[model samples]
Target chain A: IRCFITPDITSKDCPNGHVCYTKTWCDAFCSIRGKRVDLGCAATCPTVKTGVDIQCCSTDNCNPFPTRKRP
Target chain B: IRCFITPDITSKDCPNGHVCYTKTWCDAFCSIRGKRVDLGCAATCPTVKTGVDIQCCSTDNCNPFPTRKRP
Candidate 1:
């Protein structure tokens, strides 16, 4: 099973006068924001493995990838 | 005073088969990885305003930005 983890990167989370340059920062920030969520998941779903796939765009939109052919 | 904040993103921090797609995510993952450093810095430097600026490249290299003219 696959899970989507989106990180939050609001201006408030970043230093003043600087903007978040990439999605990784947003994901990290969001992860910190959702620590409680992670904790709960960890406690309840220890046996299940979580997968995170990251995609980024400069603007506020989610970009999907092309399907890869299995070798 | 300007301080640089470098975040770490290793394979351990990311999900399996997914590479960290952006610097922001790297920063966030690094931040989580470096919570101890953050905590110490936070405790010692409450009044100090830390600024974070991020730049990214596809390869394992650091690219410098051109200097901007002072307005």
Candidate 2:
């Protein structure tokens, strides 16, 4: 079961190795078995204008959700 | 007290509503108290590589770390 996960990259507690910026993009990686992905802050997010969005795809399924509409 | 953060959308910054993309899971939402669930890029993540992962459950009190391997 493969799933796509995105973490908040704006919060202060976001750790160190992770990238911190603004924009809507994928992290290009996978999460540990039982670890929660860290999605930073929407306020600090650079893609605030774009809103929140997500796309998950498995071997036979794909689901997408967006927090904002495109212009 | 209310934790469970998820992050890591593409190579960019997430915003507002929440939800990113990578092959993982667990970001159901809930991080207003201290706020810090924005788990961004594993490459850029503040946490170490597979060398460092975190888990904190309230109901059951499950706070585990995954910085290496689980087998």
Candidate 3:
């Protein structure tokens, strides 16, 4: 699967790593207090929290950017 | 530093591995809806979220059980 990572916002072809996950959060401590999002490949998904938006998918480029829609 | 892992609830002396952190959350999706806690040593601490209680410490046995007061 291929996933997008923030800042660079580039896609990485993740083969061995199976899960593509995204995290979006807006906190006062964040670099951008408005909204911050990061997407990457993980062996396992992180704990689902009540206050943060986290999505895990298993397909290529399955994760979308929090700030914009896929083209 | 040493930290306790739930279920096992045993302390492991973590030297080469740095931070000792604990996570406590009581979500309906959790195994135990009352509260679930896990503690371990990680080279890098996890992202702090608004909904979950996470604490990271540098000293030995600095992490405590979420169920009871430190003895």
Model 1's DockQ?
0.03
- Contacts from the true interface found in each model, as a fraction, amount to 0.00, 0.00, 0.00
Clashing residue pairs found in predicted model 3: none
Tens digit of per-residue lDDT, candidate 3, span B1-71: 56554557667675766656565555675653456666677754455443443444555555556434110
Ranking by lDDT: 3, 2, 1
Superposed model 1: Cα runs more than 4 Å off:
A1-71, B1-49, B60-62, B67-71
Q: Give stretches of model 2 more than 4 Å off.
A: A1-49, A64-71, B1-38, B42-71
Candidate 3: where is the Cα deviation over 4 Å?
A29-33, A67-71, B1-71
Per-model TM-score versus the true fold: 0.16, 0.17, 0.39
Tens digits of per-residue lDDT, candidate 1, A1-71, equal: 11222233221221222221221212454444531221110011112112321122222221111122000
State which candidate, 1 or 3, has the greater lDDT: 3
TM-score, prediction 3? 0.39
* CA lDDT for candidate 1: 0.20
What residue pairs clash in candidate 1, if any at all? Answer: A7-A27, A8-A30, A24-B24, A24-B25, A25-B24, A25-B25
DockQ of 3: 0.02
User: What ordering of candidates by DockQ runs from best to worst?
Assistant: 1, 2, 3
Q: Each candidate's DockQ score against the native complex?
A: 0.03, 0.03, 0.02
The digit string of per-residue lDDT tens for model 2 on B1-71 reads 21223332223332332332222223324223222223332211122222122221121111122222110
